[PDB]
From a paper:
AARSs play an essential role in protein synthesis by charging tRNAs with their cognate amino acids. The structures show the typical seven-β-strand and three-α-helix fold of the LeuRS connective polypeptide domain (CP1), plus archaeon/eukaryote-specific insertions, denoted I1ae, I2ae, I3ae, and I4ae.
Since posttransfer editing by LeuRS in apicomplexans has not been characterized, we performed binding experiments with the CmLeuRS editing domain and posttransfer editing substrate analogues for norvaline, 2-(l-norvalyl)amino-2-deoxyadenosine (Nva2AA), and isoleucine, 2-(l-isoleucyl)amino-2-deoxyadenosine (Ile2AA), which mimic a mischarged amino acid attached to Ade76. These data, together with the conservation of important active-site residues, suggest that CmLeuRS preserves posttransfer editing activity. The posttransfer editing substrate analogues Nva2AA and Ile2AA can be unambiguously placed at the editing site of CmLeuRS. This suggests a common editing mechanism via nucleophilic attack of this water on the oxygen carbonyl, consistent with quantum mechanical calculations on LeuRS. The interactions of the catalytic water and K496 at the editing site of CmLeuRS are strikingly similar to the situation in the ThrRS-Ser3AA complex, which suggests that K496 could have a similar role in hydrolysis by eukaryotic LeuRS. Compared to the structure of the CmLeuRS-AN6426-AMP complex, the posttransfer analogues retain 3 to 4 extra water molecules (depending on the monomer chain) and a phosphate (CmLeuRS-Ile2AA complex), which mediate polar interactions between the compounds and protein residues.
Numbering used by the authors:
A (entry chain A): 254 to 367, 377 to 541
B (entry chain D): 254 to 318, 323 to 541
Write the structure that this text describes.
C-alpha cells in the first residue's frame, strides 16, 4: 500500500534566465518528499540528480485538504484543455514526471484530456538547476541552494530531496563529499558560498547534536555511495531519533520528536509550505 | 471540443443466467449515447455488436446532476466503492473510462503492472462479455410504450463511439430502420443469432415531419436507395438530412410535449429524463 509523505515546497528565489519565458512570471517551487518534516529546521541545501530529467509541471494554486487517516479515497480534477486550467493554476512545480502523475491522481496538479495527461511546461536536467537559490520553510538559513547528489533514485519521491546533514547520514555524506572533493566542485561549478554548515536541531541523549556525523563514523561511511552502510545508518537514526530525539529549535523546542512531529506537519500544511503526498 | 450526448439507461428486466451471481443486489443497465433524447418515445429494440466486448462496470447511484474542470474520486479499495455504488452499467471499457473521468463511475486506486509502481487508476469492472451473449436480453426502456424491448445485433456499430450499444428508433433513424429491416427480411440471419419473432417490434409513430409524415426514416431510405445497414455513404447523407429537418420542423405526437416542435421541446425532455434518473449528461 501507499506511503504517506510530506511534500515540502521550496520556492525558487531567482528563476534561471533560460526558464524565464517558460514560467511566465508564475511562482515556481521545487518540491521534495520527506518522511521527516520535524527536521525541516535543519535544512542546509537541496539535492538533485544531475543526469535526472525533471518536468516543470503546472499545479493548482489551492488543493482540497483532507483527513487522510479517516477517509476512504482522494479526488482528482480533469479539464478539457490547458487554457481551462489557467484560472486555478498559476503555480509551477519542478519534479519528476513519475511524481507529477502521482500528484495529478490526488488533486495536486491538474489533468487534461490529452489517456489523460499532466500539463508539462517543459523538461530540464537537474544539472541545469544546480546553484539555484530557494526560499525554504522553517530553516533559519531561509535561503538555500540546489546541490548535486549522486545517490538519488528517480523512481522514488520527486527525484529532488531536502538536505538535513545534522540528522540524515545520506545528507551528511553527500555534503562532506562536496566539501572535501575539489574536483567534484570544479566539475559542477559549485561555488563555496552555496555550501552551508549543519545546524544543531535535535538532541539525542548519548550522541549530542550531530547524530548523523557520529553514525557515519560508527559505520565508517566514506562516501554518499556506500549504500549498504548508509541504509543501516538511516534506519538506526530514524528509530533512535523518533523515540529519544528532543527538538531544540522552533515552536516545539524542548519536546520529543514523537510528540511534536504531527503538530509540525499540520503547521506546515496550514501555512502552505507543504502538502500531503502519497505514492 | 467534446460533444454533449444524453446517456440513456435501459434497465435489464431479467439478468442473463450466466451473469446472475456477478450482479446480485445491484440494478443493471445497458447504457446508450444519443444526440436525440426526444426520440425515446419510439424505441423498438436496442442494438449491440455481436463481436464487441463490453464490460460490466460499477457505477455511482448519484451523480453531480461552463468550462471548469470536473472532479473525480479515486477510492483506496474496491470495498469502499460499495456503499455509494449499487448500480452496474453495461458498456465498452473505452466509454467507462470517459464516464469515470466525468464522475459517472468510480475509479479505484491501482498501479501500472509488472515493471512500474506508479499510481494508475482503474474502473471497477465486474466482468467482460461479448455482445452476442446479450442478444435477446429483455429491457425496460424509458418513454417507449413497449413494456419490454430486446437487444438485437447490428453490424454497423463502431466500438470507439459512445458505449458500443445504441438505441433503436426505426421510425426516425435511417440506420435503425435499415438494420431492423435486415433482420425482418433475412431468415438465415435470424437463425444465426436465434432471434425470436417476439423480439422484433415494429416502428412507432412519434414525430410528424412536414412533407414526410410519421415514418420519415423509411421514406429517406427509399429516397437514398438504402437497401442494407451497410450502405454507409447513403445512410450518412440520409442521417444528415433527417437531423436538421426534424429538429426545426418535426412535431412530437407522443409524450407530455405532443404538439410542440422538436427544437422547442428537446431540452425540456432531456432535463426531465435526467431529473427522473432515466439518463445522464455524457461528454465525449
Ligand atoms: C531527513 C531529512 C532529509 C532527507 N534528505 C529526506 O527527507 N529524505 C527522504 C525521506 O526522509 C526518505 C524516506 O525513505 O528518503 C528520502 N528521499 C525521498 N525521495 C528520494 C529520492 N527520490 N531519492 C533518494 N532519497 C529520497
Ligand atoms: C434517433 C435515436 C436512435 C439512434 N439510433 C441513436 O441514438 N443514435 C446515436 C446518436 O444519436 C448518433 C450520433 O451521431 O450516433 C448513434 N450512436 C451512438 N453510439 C454509437 C456507436 N457506438 N456506433 C454507431 N452509432 C452510434
Ligand atoms: K417502457
Amino acid at each position: 500500500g501507499p506511503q504517506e509523505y510530506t511534500l515540502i515546497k521550496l520556492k525558487i528565489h531567482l528563476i534561471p534566465e533560460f526558464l524565464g519565458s517558460i514560467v511566465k512570471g508564475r511562482e515556481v517551487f521545487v518540491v521534495c518528499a520527506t518522511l521527516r518534516p520535524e527536521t525541516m529546521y535543519g535544512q542546509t541545501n537541496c539535492w538533485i540528480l544531475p543526469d535526472g530529467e525533471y518536468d516543470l509541471v503546472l499545479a493548482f494554486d489551492q488543493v482540497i485538504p483532507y483527513d487522510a487517516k479517516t477517509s476512504d479515497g482522494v479526488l482528482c480534477k480533469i479539464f478539457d484543455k490547458y487554457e481551462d486550467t489557467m484560472k486555478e493554476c498559476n503555480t509551477v512545480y519542478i519534479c519528476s514526471e513519475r511524481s507529477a502523475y502521482n500528484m495529478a491522481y490526488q488533486g495536486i496538479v491538474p489533468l487534461i484530456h490529452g489517456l489523460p495527461r499532466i500539463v508539462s511546461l517543459g523538461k530540464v536536467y537537474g544539472e541545469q538547476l544546480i546553484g539555484t537559490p530557494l526560499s525554504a520553510p522553517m530553516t533559519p538559513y531561509s535561503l538555500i541552494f540546489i546541490l548535486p547528489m549522486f545517490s538519488i533514485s528517480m523512481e522514488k519521491g520527486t527525484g529532488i530531496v531536502t538536505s538535513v546533514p545534522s540528522d540524515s547520514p545520506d545528507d551528511y555524506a553527500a555534503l562532506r563529499d562536496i566539501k572535501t572533493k575539489p574536483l567534484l566542485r570544479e566539475k559542477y561549478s559549485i561555488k563555496d558560498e552555496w555550501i552551508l554548515d549543519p545546524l544543531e536541531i535535535i538532541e539525542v541523549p548519548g550522541f549530542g547534536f550531530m547524530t548523523a556525523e557520529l553514525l557515519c563514523n560508527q559505520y565508517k561511511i566514506q562516501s554518499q555511495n556506500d549504500s549498504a552502510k548508509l541504509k543501516q545508518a538511516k534506519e538506526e537514526i530514524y528509530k533512535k531519533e523518533f523515540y529519544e530525539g528532543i527538538l531544540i529549535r522552533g515552536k516545539y523546542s524542548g519536546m520529543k520528536i514523537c510528540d511534536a512531529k504531527e503538530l509540525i506537519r499540520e503547521s506546515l500544511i496550514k501555512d502552505g509550505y507543504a502538502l500531503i503526498y502519497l505514492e
